[PDB]
C-alpha cells in the first residue's frame, strides 16, 4: 500500500556499512577478531550496491566525526582517531582490490 | 651486454608516479590545470603497470614526507600537507574508480 522503496533502502545499506565499518576500526587493531569476514561484508555490500568510494569517504567523515565525540567521553587523545586514516584508506583499498580482482582482461 | 631490466622499470614508473602525483597535489587546487588529464596518467600507469593500492600509500607517505621538509622551509603550516590526505585518498579513489568501469559482469 504505501511501499516506500526509494533509494533509502540504499541508505539503509550504507547504515549497516556504518555499523560494520565500525566493527573494522573497532577489530582492526584486534588480535584475532575476523576482520576479513567484517571487511568482506563491506567490501561485498559496497560493490554489491554499486556504491562509489565518494560514499564511504563520507560514512568515514561521519564516522570519525563520531569516534571524536567519543575520544572526548574516553579522555584519551584523538590520536587514535587521527591514525583512522589509514583505516579509511585500507578500506577502500580493500574493496577496490577486489575490483581488480574481477577484471578478466577484456583486451 | 649488461641488460639490466629487473624491477627497477617498475621502479622509474615509480619514480614518474613520484613527478606526476606531485603535479596532483600541486594542481589540485589549481583553477584551471588539466589535473585529470594528470590524473590520467597516474591512473593509467597505476593501471598499466599492475601496481598495487600499497604502492601508492608509499608514494603518499614518501611525497607527504618531502612536502614536509618543504613546509618547514616554506614557514607555512603543514596544515596544507595535513589536508594532502584527501588527495591521496583521491587518487586511489580515482584510480579505482576505473577499475570499476573496467568491470563487464562476468555473471
Chains 1, 2 share one sequence.
Do not use: W
Not at 591514525?83 to 577484471?103: F, G, K, N, Q
Amino acid at each position: 500500500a504505501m511501499a516506500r522503496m526509494s533509494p533509502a533502502d540504499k541508505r539503509k545499506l550504507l547504515d549497516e556499512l556504518r555499523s560494520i565499518y565500525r566493527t573494522i576500526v573497532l577489530e582492526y587493531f584486534n588480535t584475532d577478531a575476523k576482520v576479513n569476514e567484517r571487511i568482506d561484508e563491506f567490501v561485498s555490500k559496497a560493490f554489491f550496491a554499486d556504491i562509489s568510494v565518494s560514499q564511504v569517504l563520507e560514512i568515514h567523515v561521519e564516522l570519525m566525526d563520531t569516534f571524536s565525540k567519543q575520544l572526548k567521553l574516553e579522555g584519551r587523545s584523538e590520536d587514535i582517531l587521527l591514525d583512522y586514516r589509514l583505516t579509511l584508506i585500507d578500506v577502500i583499498a580493500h574493496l577496490c582490490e577486489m575490483y581488480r580482482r574481477s577484471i578478466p582482461r577484456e583486451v
